[PDB]
Amino acid sequence: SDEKTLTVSVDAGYKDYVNKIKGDFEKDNDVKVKVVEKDMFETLEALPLDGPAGTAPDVMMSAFDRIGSLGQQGHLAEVKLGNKDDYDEKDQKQVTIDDKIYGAPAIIETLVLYYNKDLLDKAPATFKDLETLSKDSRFAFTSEKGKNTGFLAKWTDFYFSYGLLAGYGGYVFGDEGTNPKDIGLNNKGSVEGITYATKWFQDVWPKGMQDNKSADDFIQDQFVKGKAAAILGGPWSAANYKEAKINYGVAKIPTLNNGKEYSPFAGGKGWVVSNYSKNKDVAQKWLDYVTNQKNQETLYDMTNEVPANLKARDTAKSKNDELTNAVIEQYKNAQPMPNIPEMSEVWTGAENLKFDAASGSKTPQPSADDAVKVIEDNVTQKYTK
């Protein structure tokens, strides 16, 4: 009768999963769970209006990069990590801003190296191996003299190239991504990374790799047609390679020339609670439930998304799936993207940073210095000191 209820909103891809696991939660807590399907981002963009109306769901998911911001803006409730003993400090940091926790980590993801097993005997292990692969004429791009598609990476996109700069010692914001007055994108390390990228753009790759607007289309087209042997990509692309029947393999990103690992952004998703919810106690119980080992293993079983819960992540690793193994291994070297507001100013500035050098229009040092000045000035103008 008056036996409480909880509204759980998820993207279409998680509806079956939530329906499978809700039963045991309902029984364990004397609650009725209502499952609604809605695009993840649309739910979050509507929250500021649905919340005061009393029409927003009680719990939903969010990419890690938005949790801090939604928490600061007052749209998400502070929550506890019931499964803290099963989370690395890095994953706790993903859902934390200003020493306040606004979600429970659920899924991890990062960039990996996809390769074609019909073209290569094994995954390249280092960037030195990729450099030699780029001189194998079986991958020559004949319409442009001396260009090669052996290895491709969308380095005009800062989301992709960040891990290269970071592998050399670059960083976005100092104090582990929390100090917007300390920008590391023009430090010695970042410039070494930019310089290395520029060699690929200028000496190896087809001209099309410099056009950020169409580079992803070019890269996917080459890999899916068996013309690129290895490429940098996210887990989200695997489904497409499966659809196209490519005998693809997946590996950690090869080791950089300095002996350090590529250090991409550590992405993923967490479960969050509406700050407007009238069912926060039950919502807290839901977060602790859905992020426990059993339910995290079911998540992986149903969706192939890598669990945040470490006990569940080990179980996923034991399945010996290449994409899962690559993501788990590479995630060890991934750092969280800053979740502070000032991160919004990094994107436009970082475009120029990579492009001006990639195109040979500026040398790497002024390309980086000029872009950092753009970012710094925007931070000063738009945000409180």
Ligand X SMILES: OC[C@H]1O[C@H](O[C@H]2[C@H](O)[C@@H](O)[C@@H](O)O[C@@H]2CO)[C@H](O)[C@@H](O)[C@@H]1O
26, 65, 88, 301: which one binds ligand X (CB under 6 A) = 65
- DSSP per position, 120-137: -SS---BHHHHHHHTT-G
By CB under 6 A, is residue 105 in contact with ligand X?
no
Out of 236, 247, 377, 383, point to the residue binding ligand X (CB under 6 A): 236
Measured in degrees and rounded to the nearest 5, phi and psi for residue 214 equal -120, 0
The residues in 280-299 that bind ligand X, with binding defined as CB under 6 A, are: none
Binding mask 206-235 for ligand X (x = CB under 6 A): ----------------------------x-
Q: Which does 280 bind (CB under 5 to 8 A by kind): ligand X, ligand TTN, none?
A: ligand TTN
Sign of the alpha-carbon torsion through 287, 41, 339, 240: positive
Give DSSP secondary structure letters for 190-258: HHHHHHHHHHHHHHTS-GGGG-HHHHHHHHHHHHHTT--SEEEE-GGGHHHHHHTT--EEEEPPPBPTT
User: Which residue lies nearer to ligand X by CB, 65 or 321?
Assistant: 65
Residue 267 CB, nearest distance to ligand X (Å)?
Answer: 5
> Would you tell me how many other CB atoms lie within 10 Å of the CB of residue 299?
26
Least spacing, CB of residue 193 vs ligand X, in Å: 18
Site for ligand X contains 383 (CB under 6 A) = no
Residue 351 as a binder of ligand X (CB under 6 A): the answer is: no
| Contacted by 310, from ligand X, ligand TTN, none: CB < 5 to 8 Å by type | none
**In the Cβ-directed half-sphere of 188, how many Cα atoms lie within 13 Å?**
0
Q: Are 79 and 282 in contact (CB under 8 A)?
A: no
CB of 169 to ligand TTN, least distance (A): 46
236: partner contacted, choices ligand X, ligand TTN, none (Cβ within 5-8 A by kind): ligand X
Angle, CA of 229, 210 and 245, to the nearest 5°: 30
Residue 302's binding partner out of ligand TTN, ligand X, none, with CB under 5 to 8 Å set by partner kind: none
Least distance (Å) from ligand X to the CB of residue 95?
Answer: 15
Residues 6+ apart with CB under 8 A from 55: none
The entry of ligand X, ligand TTN, none that residue 341 binds, CB within 5 to 8 Å by partner kind: none
> Smallest distance from the beta carbon of 3 to ligand X, in angstroms?
37
| Residues of span 249-278 touching ligand X by CB under 6 A | 267
One-character DSSP codes across 310-360: HHHHHHHHHT--HHHHHHHHHHTT-EEPP-SGGGGGHHHHHHHHHHHHHTT
Q: Whose Cβ is closer to ligand TTN: residue 54's or residue 259's?
A: 54
| Residues lying near ligand TTN in the complex (CB under 6 A) | 277-281
The distance of closest approach from Cβ of residue 65 to ligand X in the complex, given in angstroms and rounded to an integer, is: 5
Asked whether the beta carbons of 107 and 268 are under 8 A apart, the reply is yes
> Among 90, 117, 22, 71, which residue's Cα sits nearest to residue 263?
90
Report the C-alpha gap between 328 and 313 in whole angstroms: 8
> What distance in Å separates the CA atoms of residue 273 and residue 357, rounded to the nearest whole number?
43
236 or 383: CB nearest ligand X? 236
Least distance (Å) between residue 75 CB and ligand TTN: 14
159 binds ligand X (CB under 6 A): yes
> Is the C-alpha dihedral spanning 214, 220, 225, 230 positive or negative?
positive
**Closer residue to ligand TTN in complex, CB, 286/331:** 286
Sign of the alpha-carbon torsion through 9, 89, 169, 258: negative
Question: CA 130 to CA 114: how far, in whole Å?
Answer: 13
- The SS3 assignment for 32 reads strand
Per partner kind, with CB cut-offs from 5 to 8 A, the member of ligand X, ligand TTN, none near residue 258 is: none
CB of 236 to ligand X, least distance (A): 4
Q: For ligand X, which residue of 15, 26, 38, 63 counts as binding (CB under 6 A)?
A: 63
C-beta neighbour count of 94 within 10 angstroms: 26
Query: Which residue's CB is nearer to ligand TTN, number 47 or number 204?
Result: 47
303 binds ligand X (CB under 6 A): no
In the bound state with ligand X, the residue whose beta carbon lies nearer, of 48 and 159, is: 159
347 binds ligand X (CB under 6 A): no
- Site residues (CB under 6 A) for ligand X? 63, 65, 159, 234, 236, 267
